[PDB]
Every structure is written in C-alpha cells, then in structure tokens.
Automatic annotation (TrEMBL), chains A, B:
Organism, scientific name: Thermus thermophilus (strain ATCC BAA-163 / DSM 7039 / HB27)
Main enzyme class: oxidoreductase
Record's keyword annotation contains Oxidoreductase: yes
Molecular function as annotated in GO: copper ion binding; hydroquinone:oxygen oxidoreductase activity
Alphabetical list of PANTHER family matching this protein: MULTI-COPPER OXIDASE, MULTICOPPER OXIDASE LPR1
Protein name per the record: Laccase
Positions of Cu(2+) 3 binding: H114, H375, H421
Binding site for Cu(2+) 4: H280
Residue intervals passing through the bilayer: none
Length: 439, 439
C-alpha cells in the first residue's frame, strides 16, 4: 500500500453520506502482531467520513458487541436528540443517526462510544474514527496545493491478543498503552512528495497526551478542534490532549529525515510506592519521549507561501450569564467530581437559554491535567491559567493543568439535554460529568 | 396641635422597638369630615416607627379586619421569612414580626399590607405608616441643624363616610382620590422656623403620582428609596411614583408663602368614550395640578451650607447574570403581565444565588407608567429609557414610562422566596407580580 497508512475514506455522494457501520470484535494485524480489537467497519481506526456543509448524514450503527453502545459525534454542533449521550443500543440491535451538516462548519471531528460507565474500555479497544468537514477554504491555493494527511494518534496495550484489561490504577489515571501508534501503525514513514504538508491531527487516546514537535521545524496551526483560526499561528510545539484536534501546515525546509515526536509531558498521573512505612501515592512524572512517525522531505523543498488569512471568527453577542465549574479528585477512590458531585443522568446541573452566550469558568482544583469537553455547543477559549489565548477559533475540549482556570465563551445552540465531562474517559466513567439543559 | 400635622413617632428604647399594632376600622376626623378608615394604631397614617441600625424590632400585628391581612416591610433588606409576602393573618388573629435592622442602612421606609388580591382596597382605606432608620450621618451639622419633617403623600376618596369602593376602571388604572392629602391633612401649612428644611417624602398612594415642585425653589435630593446619595443633587422638580421615597433639603431663599405642588403629570391612565360608534379607550391625559401644602418661610432666611458629601455608594462585584422582565397590559380585561404571565404563588420565576450581583433589564411594553418594585434586595438604577441615572443610591422602586427600559444592578442578599411586582397595587392584585427564589 502507500508508505503512509491512513484510514479508508468514505465520501458523501450527491449531498448524502448513507452508510451502515457495525461495531464488532475483529481479528486484524496490528503493529506486526495479530489481535482482536473492537472496530467500526472492520478497521482500526474506523473509516474516515468526509462530508461538506449541508450534506445529509445517515449512519446506521449495528451493535455486534456483547454490551450496549452508542455514538457521540464529537465536536459536531448538531441536536442532542441526534447526538444523544443517553441512548443505548442493545447488543444485536441497530440505530440510525440522521443529521444535516451545519452550513458554517469546517475541520476535523470524530466519532466514538458514549455509554456512561463503558466508554473507556470500548474506546481503548479500538472503537473510533474521524469525520472531516471539507470547506470552500480548502480551495485556496495555499491549502489546495499542500499534501494532506490525517494522523489519528491513539495508543494501545495488548494482552493475549486482545486489548489489555483496565486495572484499578487505570481507572484512576486513565489508561495509556505501550504501543504508541499513528493510524494504527507503529512509527510509519511519511515520504513527502510536496514541500508543504497539511496535517489533520486527532488525539483519540483514552488518556495519553501528545506534546508534538517536528525535528528542526515549527508547526503552523491553522485549525483547532472545531474550525479554522483567523490566520496561521507559528508554534514550536503543540500539545494535543485527549479528544482535541488541530490542523497544521508543515513547511519542509531541507532534504532529510525528521522525527515527529511526542515529547516528555507530565499530566500528573500517579503511581504507588512503599518505602518502609508508606503505601502512598507518588507522581509518575513526565511521559517517556516517543517517536510518532519518520518524515522524509523531498528533493530541494520549496514550500508554498502561508495563507495570509483563513476564516474570520464570528463576533459573538454579549454574554448573559457566568458559570463556575470546579473539578476535584478523590484519587484513591478513583472518583472524580464537578462542583462536588458525580454524574447523575436524571439530574440537570445547568439550565441555559438557546441563542444566548455564556461565560464558563472551569477551574481545575485537582493535581492531574483534566481536558474538559462540552457536547453540542462549541466554545471560544478566552484564557487559561490567566493567560489569554493567542488565537480565536472554535474548540470543544480545553486542557486544564492543576490549579488552572479556563474562561470560555459559550454560545448555546441546539435545544435539549446534553453533557459536559472530562475527556480522560475513565474519569467520565467514574463520575466527572454533568448535565446541561438548553431551552 | 403643631401647625404642621405629622404622624406620632414611636422610637426604639435601649435598642428595642417592641410594639403591638392593631389593624382596625377606626372612626376619625379626616379633612374636616368624619369617616371610618382602616388604620394601624388608630391613626391615619399609622405611627412612624423610628429606629437605628442594629436595633431589634418586635412588632405584633393584631388583625381586627373582616378579611385576612399581613405586612410588607417595604424597602427593608431583611429576610423574606420575616417580610413574608405569602403569610396570611386571619381575622382576629395576631402575628409577631421580629427582625434586626441591618447595620448599613439609612433612610425612609414604610409598612403596608401585602396579601395578594386584597392590597389595593386595604391600602386605599388607610393601612400604611412610615419607618425611619436614623443614621450617624444625621449628626453632621448641615443635617442636624435643619428642620426635619416627614411628608406622607396619600390621596383618598370618600363615599358615605367610608373609603370609596373600587370600580372596574379603578382595577385597570389604579385608584386615585379627590382628597390629595399630606399626613392625612388637607393642604396643611408648614410654618418654617429654620431656613433649611430636611423633608422625608413618601408616596403611599395606590396609584397617584406626585410631580413635586416648590414655588421659586429647587430641591436638593439627598436620599432615594433606600439610602443616601453620595452628594446632594439639585433638581427643579422631583417625580415620586407609588411606593417611592426621597429625602430633600430645601433652602428657603426669602420671606413669604410658597406652594408645594403636584404638577400636571400624565401616567397614561385611561377613560372610555362613545362618539357615535365608539365605546373605546381614550387617554385621561395629565393630572390636574394640586397644592400639597403652604410653606411659610421665616424672617430673613439664611440657609445652612449644603453637606459636601453624604455616603459613598458601595463598590459592587461584577454581575454574573442578566435578566429581562417585560411588562405588558390587557387594559380592557384589567390584566397585567410580566413575561406574558400573571402571578402564581406556587410558581418560581427567577432563581438566583445569594451574594452575587445580577443585571435586571425591566422593559415597559405597555402604555401606562409602571413603577417596578422588588422586595428584599435593594438595587442601583443604572439607566432608564437609555438615559444614565444622575446619582448612585439604593432604590427599591423604579418608574418606567411607556416603552422605557430600566437597567438595574441587583445584589442578591437574603436567601428565600420573595416577589417583584408593579406598585400600582391594583396591577399587582390583578396579576403583575412574579416570584424570585434566592439560594
Ligand atoms: Cu469525544
Ligand atoms: Cu479528568
Ligand atoms: Cu462526551
Ligand atoms: Cu410597598
Ligand atoms: Cu402597573
Ligand atoms: Cu410588594
Ligand atoms: O465525548
Ligand atoms: O410592596
């Protein structure tokens, strides 16, 4: 196949993407080994769905797992009556998700399970895929002439030819695996044919962070989770927390081999030690560095100029309410809280008004990083840790290190009941989720 | 007695004002005629209660009326478990109100009935009195040396020696009477002994407005409903809507007689006409001018200098929510609404958080003036009709002319369920009231 493995793409046809996908245990070859994973569409990752604004999506999910499951259309500002976090598809049963892609939308999104208490094992086992919304902006020469690739960043651990089971420590920290893969491949080689690359990045890991850096090169950030920036932003590195997406341009500077790495990063994961009267928690410290892929530049690279502009960010109405959402931890219990409570699907935590804007202050009072996700209503990050964000773009996950406060501008869009939760999915399963009702 | 009639004063003693008051039909002489009014403490107005911050008030109300009644401590930022708008004292029964006067408080307040559906006839019949909170500011020479008087502005209409009954038109407009009285007296004479007067003003009328102007003189506004301004404000006239209070200094300029008048004012009251195929509503137009009292200045008046400052207004925290409350009318039905609903004591309309600040935008979409009152939580009027307020002070009633929006800064104080409503009390009785719960 092509030197660089990427998931199969399924494209809408005549404005309709109609597809039947089964969630199924699937024997496959993974990183040189045979394993049985849980997959959509018989592959890991699942197929990439590629659509345009105003397309109709009609996706019938058949559940061939021994437990119930469902789908979250992560990042899509659609109705929570479609992206329904409370729906359960029993084993053997099917459900059809039908929605129209919003007109003002572009970027890299994804789909994965969201059945409370079962997300972490299902996601860890291989149930996820990407969804790309193509934009008229993709036609500008500076993007059209770039070489485009999707990178799905997901790690895995195998035991007896199956995904390794969750330990108690896994429920506390979120599970990370030793196989650090890109598109399900182990350190693939990307042999660039053009001097400018456009890379869509997705962190579909349960808990692993990717502190991304390309040897000898900066990255040019052009989109965040849910849409384009207003103009490219040069960065030396880019941290992608679980659930986050980004799009970057890479401008290859000279011939040669360059490593794309996940640099050491300490997300506050914890171990246990006994030093002669202990039996107490101790920091794991930073992750060991990982090579994600080998990037070979072409002969005499002459990259395109950067686009001068991307998409102007909408001017939002003045906000009508300010919310405060405090995250805390009980590590030894592996319990996680928002404003002192664990999730209860029958309990509404916030009630807001559609078409108004809110300010959400989300404060991490724990010691671990927590990546905060809100369904249905993309937001603009104003600041985190008291530092103003250096760009305007739509996001739907924001990472908070210990002690940090994020201030978000949240326009409420579709009416209905939805959720917000930590996207270290173990923490969500263990209670770190709440309910927002929009009317 | 003294040329200028004022209600009897009852003062706290040793930090305690303990008093038994009966609500009772009372034969009395009023404006030269014998009438039976409903009174507190056998007088009209009721006795003036005079207290200081941190005093304890223990007021036992005995109901000797043929219908249930209760008290509203209008303007007092105390608990709605004490100032309870839902409490009913049956005929023949008694209830003791006990509270501590807040430490940061000063001004002219009042007490009257608030039993939904029965307020207008009870208030019109004579059930009201003043409460004054004395302040250490009263000791500054510029106030101490002034001649102080209370003016209770209340009109009345009599029929067969009793308060005139409410007509259907009265329920629509709010009832006004032909006897326009000050402290229950008809055009009394105030023979000033000092050149500077300090007048506490109370509009205790059901519906009548007082566009106050003293012949040949400005007024110096020094307090609004619920506290002092930051410094005196010179005005040529001063409109007092139902429920409002103000304190002014008058600086007598020369010897002579000066009329204090209620100048013509059109509050949008309506009549009916038939002009040959009509039978339709027509504006009553402005009120006829009234003389309230005759003010005789002393010989060679040399008024005191004005105080340079009064009380600094508190710096409020930034607000956490914005509310919108739209007033509308169905005149021919005599029904009045807030956000399209009439009052329901079982229904909570707004839920706010104690010790936060809110912005309330109150919009009058009717054609009549509506004076909007909020219990328990005094507010700062920021602007009305798009015009910024020319002073900072605590208010608890704000007048809105047809079409006007008032923007209020509302710190939420005591926890519990309370109400907000139009203080044309007929309109409150006919539905223009809502419920705020603070937790
Ligand atoms: Cu997700
Ligand atoms: Cu978390
Ligand atoms: Cu979710
Ligand atoms: Cu009142
Ligand atoms: Cu009214
Ligand atoms: Cu009231
Ligand atoms: O999610
Ligand atoms: O009231």
């Amino acid at each position: 196949g092509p030197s660089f493995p990427e998931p199969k793409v399924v494209r809408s046809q005549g404005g309709l993407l109609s597809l039947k996908l089964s969630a199924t245990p699937t024997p496959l070859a993974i990183a040189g080994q045979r394993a049985t994973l849980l997959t959509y569409g018989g592959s890991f990752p699942g197929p990439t769905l590629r659509v345009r604004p105003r397309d109709t999506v009609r996706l019938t999910l058949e559940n061939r797992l021994p437990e119930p499951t469902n789908l979250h259309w992560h990042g899509l500002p659609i109705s929570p009556k479609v992206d329904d976090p409370f729906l359960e598809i029993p084993p053997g049963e099917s459900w059809t998700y039908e929605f129209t892609v919003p007109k003002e939308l572009a970027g890299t999104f994804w789909y994965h399970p969201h059945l409370h208490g079962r997300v972490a094992p299902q996601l860890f086992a291989g149930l996820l895929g990407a969804l790309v919304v193509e934009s008229s902006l993709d036609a500008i020469p500076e993007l059209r002439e770039a070489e485009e690739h999707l990178l799905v960043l997901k790690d895995l651990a195998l035991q007896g030819g199956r995904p390794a089971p969750h330990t108690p420590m896994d429920w506390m920290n979120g599970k990370e695996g030793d196989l650090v893969l890109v598109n399900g491949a182990l350190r693939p080689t990307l042999v660039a044919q053009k001097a400018t690359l456009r890379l869509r990045l997705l962190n579909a890991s349960n808990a692993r962070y990717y502190r991304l850096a390309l040897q000898d090169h900066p990255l040019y950030l052009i989109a965040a989770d849910g849409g384009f920036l207003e103009e490219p932003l040069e960065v030396s590195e880019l941290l992608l927390a679980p659930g986050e997406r980004a799009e970057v341009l890479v401008r290859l500077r000279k011939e040669g081999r360059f490593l794309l790495q996940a640099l050491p990063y300490d997300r506050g994961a914890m171990g246990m030690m006994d030093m002669g009267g202990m039996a107490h928690a101790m920091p794991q410290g930073p992750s060991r560095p990982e090579t994600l892929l080998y990037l070979i530049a072409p002969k005499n690279p002459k990259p395109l100029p950067l686009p001068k502009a991307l998409s102007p960010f909408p001017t939002l109405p003045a906000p009508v309410v300010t919310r405060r959402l405090v995250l805390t931890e009980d590590m030894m219990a592996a319990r996680f809280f928002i404003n002192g409570q664990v999730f209860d699907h029958r309990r509404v935590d916030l009630k807001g008004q559609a078409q108004t804007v809110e300010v959400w202050e989300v404060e991490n009072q724990g010691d671990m990083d927590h990546p905060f996700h809100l369904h249905v209503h993309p937001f603009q990050v104003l600041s985190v840790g008291g530092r103003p964000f250096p760009y305007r773009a739509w996001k739907d996950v924001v990472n908070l290190k210990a002690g940090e406060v994020a201030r978000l501008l949240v326009p409420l869009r579709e009416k209905g009941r939805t959720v917000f939760h930590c996207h270290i999915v173990e923490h969500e399963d263990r209670g770190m989720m709440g309910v927002l009702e929009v009317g």
